[PDB]
Design a protein around this ligand. Structure first.
Ligand SMILES: CCCC[C@@H](CN[C@@H](CCCC)C(=O)N[C@@H](CCC(N)=O)C(=O)N[C@@H](CCCNC(N)=[NH2+])C(N)=O)NC(=O)[C@@H](NC(=O)[C@@H](NC(C)=O)[C@@H](C)O)[C@@H](C)CC
Length: 203
């Protein structure tokens, strides 16, 4: 299919013989699912995101059907806020990110989808994250009025400053919208701006 990003890219998956809902997440290296039992042995791991880290159980070589497409790979199980399908399985099902519906660059998911952005007259690197509702940029002295906000990721919540109507050029494509500024470990471009540049998931 081709999936646009006006809504969360939620899909049904089948795993261990059970159906679950999960978010297609280009900003996640790995696939993380809420607590459940999986056949096979597991080992302890920690994974991170906004706010730090959680403990998970790593299961290897798990079959997962994702919208009807087969994958067999690593599934982390633990207290994630949302079930996410990460790049390890997205690559198996042939998923790419495409600008302007495929008229623009195609970004494969073998490595983190990092691109150059321009914001407040600065160039920065940022991750295209279909699993992010909002755009979050590392602490940056933007002039202007802001409102406080809290946003939440794998390890908890962080406090950010919300600025509205900020232009953000993404790989040469002009967007304008809300930007959150705070202590993120990676600058994140979320769906609010991805939709403006016609970015789609395709597989
Ligand atoms: C879990 C909630 C949905 C997925 C997540 C994907 N975000 C990326 C951000 C990338 C880092 C800043 C992420 O968590 N990626 C993880 C996913 C876990 C995983 N293992 O794949 C990752 O790749 N982690 C790497 C990064 C390294 C961590 N640090 C380190 N090694 N030192 C890792 N392998 O642990 N989205 C979010 O965290 C966003 N949250 C949301 O969009 C929504 N919030 C919630 C609570 O659902 C909305 C309601 O606010 C944040 C950014 C606010 C807009």
């Amino acid at each position: 299919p081709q999936i646009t990003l006006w809504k969360r890219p939620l899909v049904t998956i089948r795993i261990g013989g059970q159906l679950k809902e999960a978010l297609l997440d280009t900003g996640a290296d790995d696939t993380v699912i809420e607590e459940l039992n999986l056949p096979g042995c597991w080992k302890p791991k920690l994974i991170g995101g906004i706010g730090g880290f959680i403990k998970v159980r790593q299961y290897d070589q798990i079959p997962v059907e994702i919208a009807g497409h087969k994958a067999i790979g690593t599934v982390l199980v633990g207290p994630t806020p949302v079930n996410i399908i990460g790049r390890n399985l997205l690559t198996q099902i042939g998923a790419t990110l495409n600008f302007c519906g495929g008229g623009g660059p195609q970004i494969t998911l073998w490595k983190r989808p990092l691109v150059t952005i321009r914001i407040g007259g600065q160039l920065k690197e940022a991750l295209l994250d279909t699993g992010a509702d909002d755009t979050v940029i590392e602490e940056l002295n933007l002039p202007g009025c802001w409102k406080p906000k809290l946003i939440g990721g794998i390890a908890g919540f962080i406090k950010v400053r919300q600025y509205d109507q900020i232009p953000v050029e993404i790989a040469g494509h002009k967007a304008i919208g809300t930007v959150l500024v705070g202590p993120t470990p990676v600058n994140i471009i979320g769906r609010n701006l991805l939709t403006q540049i016609g970015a789609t998931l395709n597989f």
